Design a protein around this ligand. Structure first.
Ligand SMILES: CC(=O)N[C@@H]1[C@@H](O)[C@H](O)[C@@H](CO)O[C@@H]1O
Ligand SMILES: CC(=O)N[C@@H]1[C@@H](O)[C@H](O)[C@@H](CO)O[C@@H]1O
Ligand SMILES: CC(=O)N[C@@H]1[C@@H](O)[C@H](O)[C@@H](CO)O[C@@H]1O
Ligand SMILES: CC(=O)N[C@@H]1[C@@H](O)[C@H](O)[C@@H](CO)O[C@@H]1O
Ligand SMILES: CC(=O)N[C@@H]1[C@@H](O)[C@H](O)[C@@H](CO)O[C@@H]1O
Ligand SMILES: CC(=O)N[C@@H]1[C@@H](O)[C@H](O)[C@@H](CO)O[C@H]1O
Ligand SMILES: [Cl-]
Ligand SMILES: [Cl-]
Ligand SMILES: [Zn+2]
Ligand SMILES: [Zn+2]
Lengths: 173, 597, 597, 173
């Protein structure tokens, strides 16, 4: 049932990542071992099998993939998806510049750049409320009021670190 | 929640928004410059304006933040960049009018033509036509014709506009808390808060003029040598003790003496350090040229070009069926997108040019980590300097031998050293006085020190005094020769070319010191050295983030611009000159002119 | 008719006569030292006595002239030099005995041999054999043997004589109005009348000891560093906190640590800065060495050697069928007759020594213009210092490249620089303590401060405390270790090697300045600098015609010696040392011994 | 008759120089032009010929040859042989280290180092009378009494400037 996660035609925005649950399945992981189609695979457990899981999907900028790991600084890990310093499974990523990017621009994929306090591991904020660095309601155009959600904008002639990457984060409990 | 925090969250929004609009603008400007379609000229303006608007809107908003009330080096910088009251600081009419002038002057220069007085059918444009005369013609009068026509035509036209341009531009300067537009420009070199690395707008002139003094002797000799040589080219028209007829200098203004080489060459019997044919004989294509340049940088510890660079760059004229501009340019579109545009011909000039261009790209890469508003060279002189550094190492017979474009034999004899250095001074040293003189007038003209009734009469009181050059025909006030030169009647700060020039030599020196280099400084090839790249990238990665004083220090160990490395590059020449000038007159008298009476 | 005039005509006669006898004496001493025939040992004494007599006769006669009654600087010097009592001041028996001692000691040293305990057939001479062991052997015991045998044999023998040598030589000293023979020697450095330039016999000790204190830190690190290294060479035989076993230092006494290089080299993977093999590999012969050093002096603007030099000198051991003394010496026979005597081996030590020797000759030439009695170095340390100045420039890797003993490539990075500095310190810095300590012991014994029952207690006490060295086995008063070295039992002052080292670097600072030198003093090569050439020759020319303090000020601008230059020359190595020594004890314990175990 | 002067087996000491008169002869001088065998040839007139003389022979130290010229300071020129500031012909010298010099020492050639007053041009003093810096008869070993004549002592291993030089001085009138 992993083909339904990885080969899924469409992926979510990090600010609204999708956790698929997998129970009562048997998979080999080898459909993942044999893959130079993957620009990242850093596991945090092993690389063996037990043929028994939580798959989280989203898209991020190439240079952002570094933040999908325990400890990592901020912005994406701070406000969108934060792995736990604690336990862990694996983090997989692949370049999709011909799928999620266009020559004219692709701004469908969003992320959160403003917030009050960081997220706890696996937390998910899908609120969209005008932001002010000090509580207070807002009403843009008003100054010091900004919309917390922002679009990536993936151009197909951009640099590698600026191209879209689909990421799946498997979690064993 | 303080004013500092509200500012940070502000710039944060700016960076992300700038990046998108800016990218859309470049991709636009590029698409046009590489494919001159009709649809494109709209799009280039499309994104060109949204981007303008955004900045204007951001500038006005960024205005509502007191940077004087900020305890953070970085952010202050970014804000102040944004706090560009710009033209807006004027009024509806002033700002409207000013742009009218700017655009008009620009069009006149680019569109102005002069016609043959006894052949009114054929007119010539500054490019080529006119320029082509000023670079090859050996006819005194033909050269006289061009020179005068151009200043007497487009020059006279720009006078009225330039006069008002100065006024309108000055109000603007003073409104933003500067002495004058000059003061404005000199701003680029300023540094507030850091101690020891601080620098003022006055300090520039001070440093410029003091460093120029130490250049005169070298220049005067270069001057004397070319003078005598010119006497043989145009017998009778030149005084052995007088200045040089401005129209005989190699280009329209005498900005460079480069084309004087054909008739000032020290030993015309010497042979070829010009691998132009050696490249050709080897069936070299645009690909090889650039792959080679990549290899060069890779050797000093710098990264390959991006896969993107090779995918999106244009390394050759597409010809017809898709016209394009041909000025070689290095593009930093944004979003880690880099590329060069260059209608590459298999010339040694172009082989070097490629390294200069890729130098810029390498710089643009190194500073990509900096917040959007810091992504630029330390000052207007840094980027050009870094590029010229590259030409210098690749030009060496050593490097050219290393590549295998120069016969692994070839003795670099004492004489080809001179031929070479002279062709360098003709371009490099020949321009300093002119460039300093140019900004010296401009500067003063904005400071009120040069009355409207003594403009051109002062231009030449200084070209004679400073540059050792004279007007073949006299000019009153219906003339505006300075604007006859692009950068002038196109609103561009010119002193860059001076400070760049000085910088690049300090760089080259520090880098050959680092590359552990024994021979004369001009034979140095930083190639294959990594502690060289390191010492360089150490300042390349900063961009505008620090004060140049520091950035420069990161390479040279100096806190300021220094003439000495430049003089050292021409020490072997300098002595030869003095000798050649044994019985020649060194210096000039301001009072002589080619029309007299 | 005045007393000054009677005197003038006297010295005039002296100079002409002295020149003849002195010449015959030198040609005699030379003929002996280069060909030890029987007949020769007579004639060496022959002219050697006629010359002694002439001086003694001229001394008594010179006495009759009141120099206090003389208003001419020059003559006063000459006269006073003639106004000497020498050995004569003693009696028939004393003076006879003293010379018997002097000659006996001198013969025991030169003739002594040790025979293998378990091989009573083969015996070894201090040179080579013994010296060869001390310079190459890695065997603790073999080195223990040598060191001990030599002090056990020739050492014990000289003890009796040295004891008497001290007595008779002290009487001598006191009879000439000195405190002791020590005071006598310290005399060389004295100056009376000139104001600001006067210098007293006691000032020396004061200046010596004061200047030495400032050398300690550097020496203590060098010591700590070599100690650690030696522990790796001789596992188990050395305490990390204890002094260094005297038999392990690289030569018989540890006068120089030069042979510790092979196993204290900072970075052995570098390209060896000891060009010994390079010379060997390139087939260098003695002629090349000397012809090479001449080229060096010629380059600073000094003269070639005299045709005579090349015809008459002896630059290699004739071997057998003509034995000769091998101590490297520079002869100034007189009558412009110059030669060097040296059993030149193709080593780097020898290549440098050639420069040092030929330096002396240059000095001797430069002052041949001086009246016979002024023909000498300013003080006993000037000649040695001038020689060592030459070794300094010729040792640099830069010079080594110029000569072609080092690849025309070879990049001088900061590790080759530590290697070069470490090795210079081994020689230069290492002898400072050994020299100060030796002279102190003597000076004391002369002043009587040390009882014959502790002569060897206080020696090994100071060898432990000042030098940080320790006897591998205990020595009772049966022993006389210091006399185990040439200079001690051949009646030569030693401080010359200390005073000398300081001048060495002072002169070098000033010279490299005169040679418009780029950076650190340790990387300077004065060759090719006729200016630095000229400068040196200007205080060379002077001879002993000047008080050394003035002459020193002519070239370096200091009335007295200073340690700063030496310390700056070593700074890089100083700082690097401190770091290496971070995991080791720095300093030593006098309480540890390799035998008290 | 010049071969008789120059190739003279034996030359005198300077204090007792030999003047040969040459009249009623014809000499080409070319037997002097064609000679790198001469370390000195300073003439104080010309270098041509009239096929028509006073030849002066003696010996001196290398470094003394410089005093055989007009003007010249002293010692040799002062007390032995003084050319006239006035008129002059040629002065010739050649190194004779293997003729007048011996490895063991050659003191035959003398010179005067003490005197009362300088010599006039071409004057010649051959007196040998115990000298005193103030008139007064003498009797060596008596103090302040020295013999004016002294020997050079030419060793074969000396410096060039200490080697013997034969000198002929031609004078025209
Ligand atoms: C100098 C200062 O105030 N420190 C911080 C700096 O650490 C941080 O990188 C930067 C980014 O917003 O903000 C401030 O400049
Ligand atoms: C004879 C003597 O004592 N020598 C010097 C001499 O060197 C120098 O040329 C002269 C200058 O006044 O003074 C003395 O005469
Ligand atoms: C001018 C004068 O009286 N000076 C002389 C000096 O020339 C000479 O060399 C020296 C030798 O005795 O005596 C005096 O110093
Ligand atoms: C001028 C000088 O002192 N140098 C010469 C050198 O030119 C010559 O070739 C050589 C021959 O023996 O002797 C000297 O080294
Ligand atoms: C120390 C040194 O490099 N000396 C150089 C020599 O190498 C070179 O061949 C020559 C030519 O200019 O000048 C100097 O003698
Ligand atoms: C928002 C921002 O740009 N600041 C970062 C900060 O997160 C980081 O921890 C620190 C490095 O010490 O400085 C900047 O790179
Ligand atoms: Cl102009
Ligand atoms: Cl000892
Ligand atoms: Zn460019
Ligand atoms: Zn010596």
């Amino acid at each position: 049932p992993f083909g339904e996660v990885f080969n899924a035609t469409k992926f979510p925005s990090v600010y609204a990542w999708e956790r698929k649950k997998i129970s009562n399945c048997v998979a080999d992981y080898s459909v993942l071992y044999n893959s130079t189609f993957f620009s990242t695979f850093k596991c945090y457990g092993v690389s063996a099998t037990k043929l028994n899981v939580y798959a989280d999907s989203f898209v991020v900028k190439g240079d952002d993939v570094r933040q999908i790991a325990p400890g990592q600084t901020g912005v994406i890990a701070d406000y969108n998806y934060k792995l736990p310093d604690d336990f862990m499974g694996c983090v997989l990523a692949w370049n999709t510049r011909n799928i999620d990017a266009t020559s004219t621009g692709n701004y469908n994929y969003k992320y959160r750049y403003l917030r009050h306090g960081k997220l706890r591991p696996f937390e998910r904020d899908i609120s969209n409320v005008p932001f002010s660095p000090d509580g207070k309601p807002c009403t843009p155009p008003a100054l010091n009021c900004y919309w917390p959600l922002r679009g990536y904008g993936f151009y197909t002639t951009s640099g590698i670190g600026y191209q879209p990457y689909r990421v799946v984060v498997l979690s064993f409990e | 929640s303080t004013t500092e925090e509200l500012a940070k969250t502000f710039l944060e929004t700016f960076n992300y928004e700038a990046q998108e609009l800016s990218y859309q603008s470049s991709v636009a400007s590029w698409n046009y410059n590489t494919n001159i379609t009709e649809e494109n000229v709209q799009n280039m303006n499309n994104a060109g304006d949204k981007w303008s608007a955004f900045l204007k809107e951001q500038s006005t908003l960024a205005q509502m933040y007191p940077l004087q009330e900020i305890q953070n080096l970085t952010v202050k910088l970014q804000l102040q960049a944004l706090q560009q009251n710009g033209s807006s600081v004027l009024s509806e009419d002033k700002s409207k009018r000013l742009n009218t002038i700017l655009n008009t002057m620009s069009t006149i220069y680019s569109t102005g033509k002069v016609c043959n007085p006894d052949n009114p059918q054929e007119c010539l444009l500054l490019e080529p036509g006119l320029n082509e005369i000023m670079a090859n013609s050996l006819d005194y009068n033909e050269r006289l014709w061009a020179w005068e026509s151009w200043r007497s035509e487009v020059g006279k036209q720009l006078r009225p506009l330039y006069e008002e341009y100065v006024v309108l531009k000055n109000e603007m300067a003073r409104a933003n808390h500067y002495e004058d537009y000059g003061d404005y420009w000199r701003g680029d070199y300023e540094v507030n808060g850091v101690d020891g690395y601080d620098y003022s707008r006055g300090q520039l002139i001070e440093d410029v003029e003091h460093t120029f003094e130490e250049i005169k002797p070298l220049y005067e000799h270069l001057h004397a040598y070319v003078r005598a040589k010119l006497m043989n080219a145009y017998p009778s028209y030149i005084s052995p003790i007088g200045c040089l007829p401005a129209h005989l200098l190699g280009d329209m203004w005498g900005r460079f003496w480069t084309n004087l080489y054909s008739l000032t060459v020290p030993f015309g019997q010497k042979p070829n350090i010009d691998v132009t044919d050696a490249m050709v004989d080897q069936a070299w294509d645009a690909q090889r040229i650039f792959k080679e340049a990549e290899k060069f940088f890779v050797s000093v510890g710098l990264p390959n070009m991006t896969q993107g660079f090779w995918e999106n760059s244009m390394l050759t004229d597409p010809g017809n069926v898709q016209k394009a501009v041909c000025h070689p340019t290095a593009w930093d579109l944004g979003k880690g997108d880099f590329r060069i545009l260059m209608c590459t011909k298999v010339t040694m000039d172009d082989f070097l040019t490629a390294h200069h261009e890729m130098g810029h790209i390498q710089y643009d890469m190194a500073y990509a980590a900096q917040p959007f508003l810091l992504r630029n060279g330390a000052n207007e002189g840094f980027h050009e300097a870094v590029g010229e550094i590259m030409s210098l190492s690749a030009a060496t017979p050593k490097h050219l031998k290393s590549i295998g474009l120069l016969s692994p034999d070839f003795q670099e004899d004492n004489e080809t050293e001179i031929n070479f250095l002279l062709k360098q001074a003709l371009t490099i040293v020949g321009t300093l006085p002119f460039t300093y003189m140019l900004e010296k007038w401009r500067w003063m003209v904005f400071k009120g020190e040069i009355p409207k009734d003594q403009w051109m009469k002062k231009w030449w009181e200084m070209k004679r005094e400073i540059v050792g050059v004279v007007e073949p025909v006299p000019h009153d006030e219906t003339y505006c020769d300075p604007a006859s030169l692009f950068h002038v009647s196109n609103d561009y700060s010119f002193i860059r070319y001076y400070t760049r020039t000085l910088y690049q030599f300090q760089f080259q020196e520090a880098l050959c010191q680092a590359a552990k280099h024994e021979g004369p400084l001009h034979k140095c090839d930083i190639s294959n050295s990594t502690e060289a790249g390191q010492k360089l990238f150490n300042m390349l990665r900063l961009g505008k983030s620090e004060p140049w004083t520091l950035a420069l220090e990161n390479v040279v160990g100096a806190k300021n611009m220094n003439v000495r490395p430049l003089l050292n590059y021409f020490e072997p020449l300098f002595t030869w000159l003095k000798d050649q000038n044994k019985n020649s007159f060194v210096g000039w008298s301001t009072d002589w002119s080619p029309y007299a009476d």
